[PDB]
Swiss-Prot record, chain A:
Residues shown, of full length: 913 to 960 of 1114
Protein known as: Structural maintenance of chromosomes protein 6
Function: Acts in a DNA repair pathway for removal of UV-induced DNA damage that is distinct from classical nucleotide excision repair and in repair of ionizing radiation damage. Functions in homologous recombination repair of DNA double strand breaks and in recovery of stalled replication forks. Probably plays a role in structure.
Compartments where found: Nucleus; Chromosome
Gene: SMC6
Family, as annotated: Belongs to the SMC family. SMC6 subfamily.
Note: Present with 339 molecules/cell in log phase SD medium.
Domain notes: The flexible hinge domain, which separates the large intramolecular coiled coil regions, allows the heterotypic interaction with the corresponding domain of SMC5, forming a V-shaped heterodimer.
Organism this protein belongs to: Saccharomyces cerevisiae (strain ATCC 204508 / S288c) (Baker's yeast)
UniProtKB/Swiss-Prot annotation, chain C:
Protein name per UniProt: DNA repair protein KRE29
Subcellular location: Nucleus; Cytoplasm
Parent-protein start and end of this portion: 141 to 194 of 464
Summary of subunit composition and partner proteins: Component of the Smc5-Smc6 complex which consists of KRE29, MMS21, NSE1, NSE3, NSE4, NSE5, SMC5 and SMC6. Interacts with NSE5.
Biological role: Acts in a DNA repair pathway for removal of UV-induced DNA damage that is distinct from classical nucleotide excision repair and in repair of ionizing radiation damage. Functions in homologous recombination repair of DNA double strand breaks and in recovery of stalled replication forks.
Amino acid sequence: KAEKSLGLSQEEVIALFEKCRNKYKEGQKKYMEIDEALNRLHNSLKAR
Amino acid sequence: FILTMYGSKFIPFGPKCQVTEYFKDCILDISNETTNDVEISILKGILNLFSKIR
Amino acid sequence: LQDLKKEILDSPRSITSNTVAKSELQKSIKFSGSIPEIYLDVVTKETIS
Amino acid sequence: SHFMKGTLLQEITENLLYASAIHDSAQENMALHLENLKSLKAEYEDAK
């Protein structure tokens, strides 16, 4: 009954959560790298 | 330091002074104009202006 | 997987370039007034002079 | 144009303009990535 209410198999949902967490972590790292690069480029552009 | 020193008897304004020429030579050596601190460009301009002053 | 997920739930799930510096400047301001955020942003983002 | 090219200021202006264009494109892509990261964060909040 819980599975039919959720629809997707719990193993699939937990694997999707794990991959989503990995994607969130890599996206956060990419966002931080892009933000740092943009800030460094902005400071370099102002200095130049 | 450069702003403080100039205008005195020891470091007077003038194109013929050797000290200003040496300072300009050093600033031109460090200056690259691609990835440089603003202070280097400001020093170059100020030294040129002081050299031009008679 | 359930016990691993329980430890994963313990881990936080789902810019701040100058937030700390701007916040600390705002807290120690000694001024009774508007103190617009633009002033704090321009003061805390010089990076040159 | 002749004065700028002779004094090696034209190349500095071209490099600055190219860097400024790259910065503007990077800022637009950073805004798109922030929107995508917020959409991914909402999807991951739904996954949570």
